[PDB]
Amino acid sequence: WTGQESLSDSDPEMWELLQREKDRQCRGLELIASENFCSRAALEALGSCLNNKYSEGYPGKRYYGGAEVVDEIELLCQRRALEAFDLDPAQWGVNVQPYSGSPANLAVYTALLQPHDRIMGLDLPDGGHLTHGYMSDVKRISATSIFFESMPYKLNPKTGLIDYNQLALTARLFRPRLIIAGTSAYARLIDYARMREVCDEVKAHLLADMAHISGLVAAKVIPSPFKHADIVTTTTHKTLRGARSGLIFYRKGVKTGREIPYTFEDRINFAVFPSLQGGPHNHAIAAVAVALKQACTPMFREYSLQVLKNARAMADALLERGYSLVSGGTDNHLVLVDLRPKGLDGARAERVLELVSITANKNTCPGDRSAITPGGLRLGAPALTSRQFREDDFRRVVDFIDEGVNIGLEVKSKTAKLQDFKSFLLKDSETSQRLANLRQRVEQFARAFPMPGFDEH
Amino acid sequence: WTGQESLSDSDPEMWELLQREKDRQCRGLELIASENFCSRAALEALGSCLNNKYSEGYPGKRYYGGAEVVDEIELLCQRRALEAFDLDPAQWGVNVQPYSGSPANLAVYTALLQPHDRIMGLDLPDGGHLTHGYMSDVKRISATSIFFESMPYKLNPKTGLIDYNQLALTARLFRPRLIIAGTSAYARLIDYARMREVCDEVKAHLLADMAHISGLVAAKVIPSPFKHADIVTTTTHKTLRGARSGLIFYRKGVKGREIPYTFEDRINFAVFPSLQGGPHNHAIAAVAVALKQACTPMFREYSLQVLKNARAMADALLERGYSLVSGGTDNHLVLVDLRPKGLDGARAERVLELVSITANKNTCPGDRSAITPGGLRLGAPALTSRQFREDDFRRVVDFIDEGVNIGLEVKSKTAKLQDFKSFLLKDSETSQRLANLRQRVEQFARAFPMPGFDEH
Amino acid sequence: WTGQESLSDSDPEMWELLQREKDRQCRGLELIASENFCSRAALEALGSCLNNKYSEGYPGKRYYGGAEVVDEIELLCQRRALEAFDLDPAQWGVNVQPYSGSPANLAVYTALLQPHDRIMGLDLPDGGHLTHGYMSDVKRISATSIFFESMPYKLNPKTGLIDYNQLALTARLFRPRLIIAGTSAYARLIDYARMREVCDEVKAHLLADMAHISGLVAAKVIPSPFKHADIVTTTTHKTLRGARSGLIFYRKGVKTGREIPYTFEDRINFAVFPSLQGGPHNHAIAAVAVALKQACTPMFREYSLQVLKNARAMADALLERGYSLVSGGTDNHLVLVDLRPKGLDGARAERVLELVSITANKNTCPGDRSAITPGGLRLGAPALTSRQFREDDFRRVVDFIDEGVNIGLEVKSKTAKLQDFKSFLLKDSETSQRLANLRQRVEQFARAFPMPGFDEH
Amino acid sequence: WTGQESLSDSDPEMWELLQREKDRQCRGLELIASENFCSRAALEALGSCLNNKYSEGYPGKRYYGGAEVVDEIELLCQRRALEAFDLDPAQWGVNVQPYSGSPANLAVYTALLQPHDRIMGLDLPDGGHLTHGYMSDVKRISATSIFFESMPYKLNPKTGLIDYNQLALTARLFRPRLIIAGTSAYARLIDYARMREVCDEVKAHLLADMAHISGLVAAKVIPSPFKHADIVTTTTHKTLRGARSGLIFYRKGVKGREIPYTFEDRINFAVFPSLQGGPHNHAIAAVAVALKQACTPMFREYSLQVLKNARAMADALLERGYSLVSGGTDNHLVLVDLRPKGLDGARAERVLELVSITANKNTCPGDRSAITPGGLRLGAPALTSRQFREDDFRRVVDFIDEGVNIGLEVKSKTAKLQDFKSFLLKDSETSQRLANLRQRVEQFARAFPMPGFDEH
Ligand SMILES: Nc1nc2ccn(CCCCCc3ccc(C(=O)N[C@@H](CCC(=O)O)C(=O)O)s3)c2c(=O)[nH]1
Numbered sequence A, C: 001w002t003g004q005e006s007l008s009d010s011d012p013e014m015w016e017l018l019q020r021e022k023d024r025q026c027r028g029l030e031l032i033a034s035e036n037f038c039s040r041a042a043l044e045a046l047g048s049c050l051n052n053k054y055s056e057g058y059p060g061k062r063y064y065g066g067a068e069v070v071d072e073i074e075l076l077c078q079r080r081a082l083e084a085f086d087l088d089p090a091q092w093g094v095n096v097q098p099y100s101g102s103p104a105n106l107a108v109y110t111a112l113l114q115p116h117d118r119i120m121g122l123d124l125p126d127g128g129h130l131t132h133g134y135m136s137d138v139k140r141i142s143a144t145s146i147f148f149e150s151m152p153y154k155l156n157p158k159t160g161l162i163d164y165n166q167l168a169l170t171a172r173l174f175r176p177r178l179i180i181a182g183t184s185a186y187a188r189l190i191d192y193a194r195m196r197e198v199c200d201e202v203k204a205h206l207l208a209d210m211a212h213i214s215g216l217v218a219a220k221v222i223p224s225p226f227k228h229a230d231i232v233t234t235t236t237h238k239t240l241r242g243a244r245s246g247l248i249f250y251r252k253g254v255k256t257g258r259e260i261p262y263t264f265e266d267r268i269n270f271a272v273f274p275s276l277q278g279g280p281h282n283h284a285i286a287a288v289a290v291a292l293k294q295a296c297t298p299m300f301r302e303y304s305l306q307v308l309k310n311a312r313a314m315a316d317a318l319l320e321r322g323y324s325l326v327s328g329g330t331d332n333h334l335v336l337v338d339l340r341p342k343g344l345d346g347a348r349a350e351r352v353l354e355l356v357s358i359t360a361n362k363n364t365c366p367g368d369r370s371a372i373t374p375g376g377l378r379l380g381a382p383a384l385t386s387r388q389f390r391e392d393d394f395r396r397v398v399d400f401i402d403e404g405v406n407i408g409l410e411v412k413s414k415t416a417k418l419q420d421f422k423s424f425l426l427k428d429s430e431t432s433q434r435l436a437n438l439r440q441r442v443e444q445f446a447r448a449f450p451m452p453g454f455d456e457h
Numbered sequence B, D: 001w002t003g004q005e006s007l008s009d010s011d012p013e014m015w016e017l018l019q020r021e022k023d024r025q026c027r028g029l030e031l032i033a034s035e036n037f038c039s040r041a042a043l044e045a046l047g048s049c050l051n052n053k054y055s056e057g058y059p060g061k062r063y064y065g066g067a068e069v070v071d072e073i074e075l076l077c078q079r080r081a082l083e084a085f086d087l088d089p090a091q092w093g094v095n096v097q098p099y100s101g102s103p104a105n106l107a108v109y110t111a112l113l114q115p116h117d118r119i120m121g122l123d124l125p126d127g128g129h130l131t132h133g134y135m136s137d138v139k140r141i142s143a144t145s146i147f148f149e150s151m152p153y154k155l156n157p158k159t160g161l162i163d164y165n166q167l168a169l170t171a172r173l174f175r176p177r178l179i180i181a182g183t184s185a186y187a188r189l190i191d192y193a194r195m196r197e198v199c200d201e202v203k204a205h206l207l208a209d210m211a212h213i214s215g216l217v218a219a220k221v222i223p224s225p226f227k228h229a230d231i232v233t234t235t236t237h238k239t240l241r242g243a244r245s246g247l248i249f250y251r252k253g254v255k256g257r258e259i260p261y262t263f264e265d266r267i268n269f270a271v272f273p274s275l276q277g278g279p280h281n282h283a284i285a286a287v288a289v290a291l292k293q294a295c296t297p298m299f300r301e302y303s304l305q306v307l308k309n310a311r312a313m314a315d316a317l318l319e320r321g322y323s324l325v326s327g328g329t330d331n332h333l334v335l336v337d338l339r340p341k342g343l344d345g346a347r348a349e350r351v352l353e354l355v356s357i358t359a360n361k362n363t364c365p366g367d368r369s370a371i372t373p374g375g376l377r378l379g380a381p382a383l384t385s386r387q388f389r390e391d392d393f394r395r396v397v398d399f400i401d402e403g404v405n406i407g408l409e410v411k412s413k414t415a416k417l418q419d420f421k422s423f424l425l426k427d428s429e430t431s432q433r434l435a436n437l438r439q440r441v442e443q444f445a446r447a448f449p450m451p452g453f454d455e456h
């Protein structure tokens, strides 16, 4: 045994599983708004010897030795992080060790808040993320609602937009110490200035969780939250098209003749390590650095502009075929389809689209009373846009979706409960082959496009 | 732009850094007890298209679709985890989604405890990990001491063993609901039967954090904590020689009535949706690769080797002029006490690093100082994976001995620790004396094979 | 030394101090809405040998012996408590050991909630009490906001009434586990049914803190909160005209064929003792029992009806002299005077009225921006009504208040900051004697009325 | 209706109960160590018009007006409190508003600690009070263990003294920010100098809860905790012979710079507005009356008497056939161990109550049971205020001895504790044997003078 054998030679069971997933991504129309296809260059850093190096601590302030090189990697990642978002290194710092997006947010709360201090975020069914403090009416779901006290703000169910007025009203009563400006399922731009005013009034930290829109922010195609946020967290594997990791951007420098300084850096860094995490995943840090360099290129601005145009085209196409969209349209990478005016819930549509190799997620529309069967779908452009999809290609995506919706509508006719629906898609021969025909035409269409990453895994 | 360009072509600045780090691992003798050299097979899975897949939830209970393949990847990782530790799938389950070791432990506390519920672990300067509840006298350090109430248990300060009596005494006063039997810097073995007895009495959960010793347990080379522990957490790197990830093993099934075990649902819910978001499916897959390697006859011979190279390192260290904490290693690492040699554990680590031996300073029982601890932590697993054997490991000890002796000569001419390191780079007599060793250090280490890719 | 000497003989320094306070209560117009004059019968029980008896525990379940008699006293107090409020002993229980009102409320939270569970009450400047969870924008004030997480509900500043709509909206976001229906400075009746609906929706306990209105509730002159509340707490020294103590009323009995039982009794009793308190003050328990018996009499219903008529007469008189009142009037024992439309803040008016032996408290009106100088006063009828004040007498009280307001208006002319105002009342000879004349006419008028309690102390 | 009618005329049902309770205290021998007979002067202030005055706030810093008189009442109570304990008003302050002892302690924790901060006290079965943080193995009992994290310190189970060594050992592990030196059932004296040393080391607040021994401290008859404690809490009844209330004494003033003491503002804010509402000015006044009595030469002779009647009770108890915990009382109470006499402390308390001797069962070191503890707590202060002396106190011991012996005879004919008490009321042989003693018990006690009113 040498440890240098190939995965295909050493573990054919796993090696084929990798190939099965690669074929699945190659043949499908991937519309998960949070998914992307990472570049081979980044993946080469992700699966590297940097996995072997323990480097607990920070560059220049480590707890072991031998970190000479990974110090330069981590410092280079920090510089590329600030560069990609046009940040002055004298006003902004970045922590590049958060293992993912959820660890990034929990680090911020741990850094700035005491246990049971109060947090406000967009409610999860309203388009906010778990780590913005999600509690149900029965259970504390996210740990950000266990270790901290969270009250959500809601959408205006008339506009589909964030009710900044109701947020301002309830924030003066709840008195949060931090408010999260950031979403998982929101098609519109966020009024960060308005969020800033609310935070300045109730004396709260404004945290921007730009995970979904980070790539658009780096390409300067949408307004940047760094103009108004004290803290900015993001995922690196969404519109940033990198490995799965997280980042925490924080302000530095000046916040009666007294110079008020920012105190985020030391608290944030201490929260990530040693408070929350152990050894940094330097392979992930490096892979993120590779993608961050890609985010400064003119190529990436072209890419991000395409993501915008393909989501508007997807939205326009859906509107033209009789679909309503929450908030009426989109100004970013995703579309929130309201399927209630067509008679199919988002749960049925998600499964029937999945059987024809169209990958989306059910989504709650304003007014939904059921979570077993939400009334919408979330569709995202970033992944297929990385496969060099253009506006016409996304209009064909909408025409495949419309076929799936019709097949699902015909099955809800012939079925009762949700489980009868799902089993009917597999056991009824007529619809089983009708699905297989659409699946085949979906996969033939998607296979023709180029795919970032390795060829075979 | 296609996204299929090579790293060397598209990002030469990063590619050179990768090559520089690979050269650093190839040329050095890696003695950090928590480090290992991951196999090429796992690394190819770590850097795979599985990074691209969001698969929030668990197999059969995910929240969107498209998880057809990663469901079987996660299930295969689960099966390989239970197989690797000889666990009956009806008595034990495993969560394979923890991002690392620290998240694995924090999920367990979240799953089983309420905020501010009480936990007991070995103190960090006594050899315990941060995530076992470490707070100092000045500051709450680990979040496991912020969100939960922690009191440490200590070593017998001249036996070098865990003071199991003092732990039993304080457990009835503190009344913890969970005690962690697991270490980061402990050369001997843990009495899991005794830990369970203490835990069974004060009615606390026994969790074993076998991160450092997980590989030795899987090879059935050391006693397994799964015989007495309710929950077991581990890292997938270290002695398991895998990607950076974490695992949570929990008991399952039946505990005048039938009381069932209720760990599974709580543990899984704590990992997702409570603490983490989307699983790192590439890490899960790479872990599955390494777990399969842990079932091999090869891995038992590998793990058996690590013990004897640590015992050989200990024996060799006892000679020359070193005493070692606990008097005798029984695992993969050695706790060497450098106080009976006039050199602190901090400066010895720095002098060894400039000569390409990477270790970590460690606090020995009685250390009156943390700026300058009195020991070093040395680990066998990394070099053993480079096919080092006992004769190869006795040479590192005297390669270290040249480093400890060379370091003593400069503390002669300097006072504080800043002056110490400063003289190592500016005095032409020692910079050459460092380089002279530095070549024979790298010349010796380069000759051994290295797991992973050749160039990155 | 025998321990049987008189206070006048053993401690003349204290004995005269007692007499000075008795003269002060006899000569003044006591308008503190929370104050009353306790009967001699109750005071005789208050200062009795029951002080000597430790009786930790409860009747029939004590931890020592010798409680044979105090068991009957405590049981008799419980029966008189239920009797006075027309409560079926099979549906209601009462704990009579809370040392005061604040201990009563903290016992309820401790009994029913975990630390950091959420609480909702009327904001303190809006008329709620500290123990309803009062936090400022800078500091946790009440311990009910330290050990539990509180969000306040506010008044509708247009009506002066509780904004039950905004309470319903914010309760669905905050998700409290207990809501407090009870006030310290509120002139109107509380919609307990509406509070009940809000609690039933968000699945919270409804606690009624009837402290100020308890006597009116016992006399059945205003609607009873026991028809809608799960828990009822009260002070015994306000409109109940008893010794200073507290009570916790809780439901008992029945809350798919399963009989759902109430679980308040054991938790409430355990919270009071041993969780929060030590030995019960049996002298206070007995004195409360004496006053509770008085609350069942036709005399007390006459008294409580008079308190209503004297507050309406006080309100009518103020309205006729150019004063506005928050919420426009009163349906209980107190009046909230808005002094902003007359140019005097409630802080100045309170001090100038105090120097002429009229005792009130400054009060915050809706829209007040300052707490140094609130814009109103809280005036209460219960105390003087116990001195056999009638409607005409309270119209004379208003005519004394109007003289004090005018004297204060003349001094704000001649002064600047608040401290200049207060010192001018003592150091300026012209106003000093002008005050002394009004004080004398106030005291001559009040001395003529009978006074409950002892003659000399 | 005027409100000036007498209690006997207006409420005869209650008036008879009052007379019945006064007769019960007059006819019985009160041996509860925490009970006393309050003076008429204080009771007349307790039941005064001061009940009618709301005076939220503090003298000079109240929130409404009309507090002209009660300001001087509270200030006089403050001055009398500091005077009674020989405190310099520049080094010590006092809050006189705590409703009782339990609120006094809870205010201190609220003032100085954050929720879930750590506290250490003597365990309740070891002689500590609820408010020192008592939680059992099943339930959090006191709110001082709910809102704050408590670990108890224990006695040396055969020395009967506080295990100051084990307390020093656990304090460095638990790292409390406050330790309570104070007891409800402890016959010896507390090493406040040693408690401060432990507190000074682990950097914790030393609070002394002198409730039981406050009167002995004021008479300078026992060593005063104010020499080493940062904060001192007490009840105003018990040995202080006052109304039911509580006090919080705190250090004030100055603690290369000048660090001032910061207790005053926090303590006062915790009492009001954090925890309590309006002060019970009648209780404050009655307390002031009793505090003035504590400055008398009479009170030192009274407190000196209580010691010798407890020492006489202990000496007499050592005879007959009783062993007592800690071997020797040095305060106002005796911890008698009834296990070396075949009778449990629970049944002895009941048999003594039917013969008009009121005591409380108490757990002795080694008690394998709480349903039936192995001791009784007996206190001198109550009967000493009735001008009992050593000869009078040696007769109570053998009045008790008839009770302990009579109780042994019925456990003969019964099994469980329910059958025990049931036989005391239904068997004509023992009900007469109880009544025969019961008259000589009441006949003996009635002859002594009684503080307070004659009829209520
Ligand atoms: N707007 C939004 N959209 C997207 C899409 C992906 N994510 C990322 C996270 C995906 C997970 C979403 C949930 C996990 C658990 C939930 C819950 O409420 N669970 C209850 C009741 C369930 C039952 O009774 O059916 C329980 O089981 O206890 S919802 C999000 C997101 O964060 N927000």
Ligand SMILES: Nc1nc2ccn(CCCCCc3ccc(C(=O)N[C@@H](CCC(=O)O)C(=O)O)s3)c2c(=O)[nH]1
Residues within 6 Å of the ligand: A056, A063, A274, B124, B125, B126, B127, B128, B129, B130, B131, B136, B138, B139, B141, B183, B184, B185, B360
């Ligand atoms: N047996 C064991 N060994 C090893 C070796 C590495 N690690 C991984 C842990 C790496 C070290 C983490 C820290 C511990 C204490 C800290 C501290 O004292 N921090 C300052 C803060 C400000 C300052 O810089 O002065 C303070 O609170 O005073 S930091 C471990 C481990 O977990 N367990």
Ligand SMILES: Nc1nc2ccn(CCCCCc3ccc(C(=O)N[C@@H](CCC(=O)O)C(=O)O)s3)c2c(=O)[nH]1
Residues within 6 Å of the ligand: C123, C124, C125, C126, C127, C128, C129, C130, C131, C136, C139, C141, C184, C185, C361, C371, C372, D056, D063, D273
């Ligand atoms: N509506 C209403 N009215 C009445 C009348 C009597 N009470 C009973 C309780 C009376 C006490 C009222 C307050 C105590 C502390 C306050 C506060 O906000 N203190 C801050 C800022 C102060 C400053 O900066 O001037 C601080 O000092 O920290 S308000 C109440 C009542 O409960 N609610």
Ligand SMILES: Nc1nc2ccn(CCCCCc3ccc(C(=O)N[C@@H](CCC(=O)O)C(=O)O)s3)c2c(=O)[nH]1
Residues within 6 Å of the ligand: C056, C063, C274, D124, D125, D126, D127, D128, D129, D130, D131, D136, D138, D139, D141, D183, D184, D185, D360
């Ligand atoms: N040295 C000292 N002596 C004396 C004598 C009276 N007290 C005053 C304290 C009076 C007793 C308070 C309690 C303690 C433990 C309880 C308990 O165990 N309760 C059950 C709950 C349900 C049940 O009824 O089974 C449980 O949790 O199991 S109750 C004290 C004192 O404070 N300290």
Ligand SMILES: Cc1ncc(COP(=O)(O)O)c(CNCC(=O)O)c1O
Residues within 6 Å of the ligand: A033, A034, A100, A101, A102, A103, A129, A131, A182, A183, A184, A185, A209, A210, A211, A212, A235, A244, A245, B054, B276, B277, B278
């Ligand atoms: C705004 C936001 N923040 C944080 C996270 C957490 O990232 P990790 O999953 O890497 O922990 C997500 C993931 N969102 C999942 C989705 O929208 O499908 C997110 O959308």
Ligand SMILES: Cc1ncc(COP(=O)(O)O)c(CNCC(=O)O)c1O
Residues within 6 Å of the ligand: A054, A277, A278, A279, B033, B034, B100, B101, B102, B103, B129, B131, B182, B183, B184, B185, B209, B210, B211, B212, B235, B244, B245
């Ligand atoms: C016993 C133990 N548990 C948990 C962790 C945390 O693992 P991550 O660093 O992957 O979070 C470590 C790391 N120990 C570091 C060392 O011994 O050098 C450990 O030693």
Ligand SMILES: Cc1ncc(COP(=O)(O)O)c(CNCC(=O)O)c1O
Residues within 6 Å of the ligand: C033, C034, C100, C101, C102, C103, C129, C131, C182, C183, C184, C185, C209, C210, C211, C212, C235, C244, C245, D054, D276, D277, D278
């Ligand atoms: C509604 C309410 N609840 C509880 C309390 C507390 O009672 P104690 O002060 O007895 O603790 C008060 C006192 N209110 C004071 C006032 O209105 O002037 C109150 O008004």
Ligand SMILES: Cc1ncc(COP(=O)(O)O)c(CNCC(=O)O)c1O
Residues within 6 Å of the ligand: C054, C277, C278, C279, D033, D034, D100, D101, D102, D103, D129, D131, D182, D183, D184, D185, D209, D210, D211, D212, D235, D244, D245
């Ligand atoms: C030391 C001590 N501290 C505080 C308290 C509480 O006091 P209140 O009961 O007034 O709250 C007690 C009561 N001890 C009861 C007994 O020894 O019998 C006590 O003994």
